[PDB]
Enzyme design. Structure first.
Site, short mmCIF file in Angstrom:
data_model
loop_
_atom_site.label_atom_id
_atom_site.label_comp_id
_atom_site.label_asym_id
_atom_site.label_seq_id
_atom_site.Cartn_x
_atom_site.Cartn_y
_atom_site.Cartn_z
N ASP A 7 0.87 -1.17 0.00
CA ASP A 7 0.00 0.00 0.00
C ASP A 7 0.91 1.22 0.00
O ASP A 7 1.47 1.61 1.03
CB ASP A 7 -0.95 -0.03 1.19
CG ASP A 7 -1.63 1.31 1.47
OD1 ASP A 7 -1.82 2.12 0.53
OD2 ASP A 7 -1.97 1.57 2.64
N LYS A 68 2.44 11.11 -3.98
CA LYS A 68 1.20 10.60 -4.55
C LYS A 68 0.31 11.71 -5.11
O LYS A 68 -0.52 11.44 -5.98
CB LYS A 68 0.44 9.80 -3.49
CG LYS A 68 -0.56 8.76 -4.03
CD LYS A 68 -0.90 7.78 -2.93
CE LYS A 68 -2.00 6.83 -3.31
NZ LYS A 68 -2.61 6.18 -2.10
N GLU A 172 -7.45 0.63 -4.11
CA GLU A 172 -7.37 0.49 -2.66
C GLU A 172 -8.68 -0.01 -2.07
O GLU A 172 -8.63 -0.93 -1.23
CB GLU A 172 -6.89 1.81 -2.04
CG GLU A 172 -5.46 2.25 -2.52
CD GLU A 172 -5.11 3.72 -2.26
OE1 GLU A 172 -4.06 4.21 -2.75
OE2 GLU A 172 -5.86 4.40 -1.55
N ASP A 196 -12.68 5.47 3.76
CA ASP A 196 -11.23 5.46 3.94
C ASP A 196 -10.73 6.84 4.35
O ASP A 196 -10.65 7.74 3.52
CB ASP A 196 -10.57 5.01 2.65
CG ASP A 196 -9.12 4.71 2.82
OD1 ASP A 196 -8.48 5.30 3.71
OD2 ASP A 196 -8.62 3.88 2.04
#
Ligand code: 7UE
Ligand code: K
Length: 536
Positions: A7, A68, A172, A196
Site C-alpha cells: 500500500d 502521490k 485500494e 477510507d
C-alpha cells in the site's frame, strides 16, 4: 519466494505478505508496521521512511512527501498548482511535468514523482526482504480507485524502477474488501461502501461483488481532509488556551508549535480509548510550563464540522451509484482516523445501526488485501448483462448482470420511424452503454408489422435463460401474434473470469462517457430495422 502486496499511501506506506496460510504485515527497521512516505536528501545521504520523517524539522526544503499528489499529473494541473502553496520543498516545470527539486550532496537534483515513490517502494522492498530473508521481486501495488490510466502507469513505473515486477495494479477499496473476504460471501450481488480516512485524504467508494468480481460504482471524498486536520484543530485550541491563560502567543516560536502538535497527536490517540487526555509540556514558551487536559467532548466540538462533513461524500456516492443507504450490505473502515469514536458513531447512526467491518487494523487492511491478491496471482448468476440494440446503437438491458438463473424477463418496445414494417432484434452481451462496445450474440428480424405512427406498434421481446445457461430471445408483434425467436448456445468457458473483469473495468473507465451517451437518446425502447453499427 512469494510476492508482496504494498500500500503506497500518500503519507504512510505498508507492506504485507501471505505466507503459510496467514497474512503478515511486516515491521520496518525501527519496528513500525507502517513507514512514512518521506524521502529526505542531505549533504551526505539519502533518507527514506522514519529517519526521513524524523529529520523534517531540520531539513524541510530537502524532505519530500505527498508525492502521490503529483504522480501522473501535468505540472499545470490545478491540484498540483494549489498543493505547492503548502509544500516546503520545491516543484518545477520540466516540459509540463512536475519534478521535485532538492539539493543532494552539494549538487542540485530533480526527480519525477515516479522516482520519489520508487524510493519508497525500495524501502518497502528491503523491509520485506529483511523479514523474509530472501530477495523479493513480485509485488501487487494499490492505487486510489479514482486514478486514471496515467496515474496507474506512473505508479507501476515507480515499482519497476524499484526493481519490482508489478503483477497487477488494484484499487485500494477493492484490496480492502479482499482483506475482509467480502468476495467469498454467498448470495446475490453485494454493495460495499469503503470509508477510507487517512492522515491526509478521505475517500468513499461503493463496490458491487458477485461471483468474485468487483465493479466500482462510485467514488467521492476530500483529498485534503485527514487526521492531521483534527490535530491542527487541537493545536489552535491550545494556542489560544495558552494565550488566554498566559497572555503569550507561542505561534512565532517554531519548536514550541511542533512540540504542541506532537502532544496533540498523542492525545488524539488517547481520545480513541479514553474520555480525557493530558497535555504535559515543560517550558513550552518563555519558560511557562503547559499542563492541561482535553476531553473527548471538547475534541469532538473542535472537529464537529469535519466529522459530520464526512457523511456528505457518503451521500454523494450513494447518489452517484443510484443506491439507497438501505442497499449497502457491508461497510469497511479503512485508515487510522476511522478509529475516532465519533467517526464510527456518525457513520453507524447514518446507517441505522449497521455493524461496521473494522476488525482488521484499518491502517493495514489495504496492504493486507493487496497481499491476498499477490499470493493469488503468485500461486450461479449470469456473467454479463443481456440486452438489445435500441435506436442509436444504444444498449437496452433486459437481464442485469449477477441476475440468478433460471430467469425470464420481458419488456415492450416500439418503432422509431413511422410505418416501420419491421424491427431488427440484436442481442448483445456487455456493460457498456453503446452496443458497439459490447458483444453481439445473435440477430433476427421481426417483420410484417402493420403500418402505424412511430411509438404505436407494440413489440414484446422476452429474454429466457434456462438453468443450463441457454438463452432464448423471442419477439411478438402484439397487434398480430406474429413471433420470432433465437436460441443462443451457452459455450462453456467462452469467457474466462478475467474476461468478465476487462468488460466490467472498461465500463468503470468510461462510466461518465457512457452516462452522457445514455442521456442523449430519447428512444425509451424504440427499435430500428437496421444494425446501427453498420450504417454509413
Ligand atoms: O490515526 C489516528 O487518527 C488514530 C486515532 N486514534 C487512535 C489511533 N491509534 C491507537 C493505537 C494505534 C493507533 C490512531
Ligand atoms: K496505495
Amino acid at each position: 519466494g512469494p510476492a508482496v502486496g504494498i500500500d503506497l499511501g500518500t503519507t504512510y506506506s505498508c507492506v504485507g505478505v501471505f505466507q503459510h496460510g496467514k497474512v503478515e504485515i511486516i515491521a520496518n527497521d525501527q519496528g513500525n508496521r507502517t513507514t512514512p512516505s518521506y524521502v529526505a536528501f542531505t549533504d551526505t545521504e539519502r533518507l527514506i521512511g522514519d529517519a526521513a520523517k524524523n529529520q523534517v524539522a531540520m531539513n524541510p526544503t530537502n524532505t519530500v512527501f505527498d508525492a502521490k499528489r503529483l504522480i501522473g499529473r501535468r505540472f499545470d494541473d490545478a491540484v498540483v498548482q494549489s498543493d505547492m502553496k503548502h509544500w516546503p520543498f520545491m516543484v518545477v516545470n520540466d516540459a509540463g511535468r512536475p519534478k521535485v527539486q532538492v539539493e543532494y550532496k552539494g549538487e542540485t537534483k530533480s526527480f519525477y514523482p515516479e522516482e520519489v515513490s520508487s524510493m519508497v517502494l525500495t524501502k518497502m522492498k528491503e523491509i520485506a526482504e529483511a523479514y523474509l530473508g530472501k530477495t523479493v521481486t513480485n509485488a501487487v501495488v494499490t492505487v486510489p480507485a479514482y486514478f486514471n490510466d496515467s496515474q496507474r502507469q506512473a505508479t507501476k513505473d515507480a515499482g519497476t524502477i524499484a526493481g519490482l515486477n508489478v503483477l497487477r495494479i488494484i484499487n485500494e477499496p477493492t484490496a480492502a474488501a479482499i482483506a475482509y473476504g467480502l468476495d467469498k460471501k454467498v448470495g446475490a450481488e453485494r454493495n460495499v461502501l469503503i470509508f477510507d480516512l487517512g492522515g491526509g485524504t478521505f475517500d468513499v467508494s461503493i463496490l458491487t461483488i458477485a461471483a468474485g468480481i468487483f465493479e466500482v460504482k462510485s467514488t467521492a471524498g476530500d483529498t485534503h481532509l485527514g487526521g492531521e486536520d483534527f490535530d491542527n484543530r487541537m493545536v489552535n485550541h491550545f494556542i489560544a488556551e495558552f494565550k488566554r491563560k498566559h497572555k503569550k502567543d507561542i505561534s512565532e516560536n517554531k519548536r514550541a508549535v511542533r512540540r504542541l502538535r506532537t502532544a496533540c497527536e498523542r492525545a488524539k490517540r488517547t481520545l480513541s480509548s479514553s474520555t480525557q487526555a493530558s497535555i504535559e509540556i515543560d517550558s513550552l514558551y518563555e519558560g511557562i510550563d503547559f499542563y492541561t487536559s482535553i476531553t473527548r467532548a471538547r475534541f469532538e466540538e473542535l472537529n464537529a464540522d469535519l466529522f459530520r462533513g464526512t457523511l456528505d461524500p457518503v451521500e454523494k456516492a450513494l447518489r452517484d451509484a443510484k443506491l439507497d443507504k438501505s442497499q449497502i450490505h457491508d461497510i469497511v473502515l479503512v485508515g487510522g482516523s476511522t478509529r475516532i469514536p465519533k467517526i464510527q458513531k456518525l457513520l453507524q447512526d447514518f446507517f441505522n445501526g449497521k455493524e461496521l467491518n473494522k476488525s482488521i487494523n484499518p491502517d493495514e487492511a489495504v496492504a493486507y488485501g493487496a497481499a491476498v491478491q499477490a499470493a493469488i496471482l503468485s500461486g450461479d448468476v449470469t456473467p454479463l448483462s443481456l440486452g438489445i440494440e435500441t435506436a442509436g446503437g444504444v444498449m437496452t438491458v433486459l437481464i442485469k448482470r449477477n441476475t440468478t438463473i433460471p430467469t425470464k424477463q420481458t419488456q415492450t418496445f416500439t418503432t422509431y420511424s413511422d410505418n416501420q414494417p419491421g424491427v431488427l432484434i440484436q442481442v448483445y452481451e456487455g456493460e457498456r452503454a453503446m452496443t458497439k462496445d459490447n458483444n453481439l450474440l445473435g440477430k433476427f428480424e421481426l417483420t410484417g408489422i402493420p403500418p402505424a405512427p412511430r411509438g404505436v406498434p407494440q413489440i414484446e421481446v422476452t429474454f429466457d435463460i434456462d438453468a443450463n445457461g441457454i438463452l432464448n430471445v423471442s419477439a411478438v408483434d402484439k397487434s398480430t401474434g406474429k413471433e420470432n425467436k433465437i436460441t443462443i448456445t451457452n459455450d462453456k468457458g467462452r469467457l474466462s473470469k478475467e474476461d468478465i473483469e476487462r468488460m466490467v473495468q472498461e465500463a468503470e473507465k468510461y462510466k461518465a462517457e457512457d452516462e452522457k451517451q445514455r442521456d442523449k437518446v430519447s428512444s425509451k425502447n424504440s427499435l430500428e430495422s437496421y444494425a446501427f453499427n453498420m450504417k454509413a
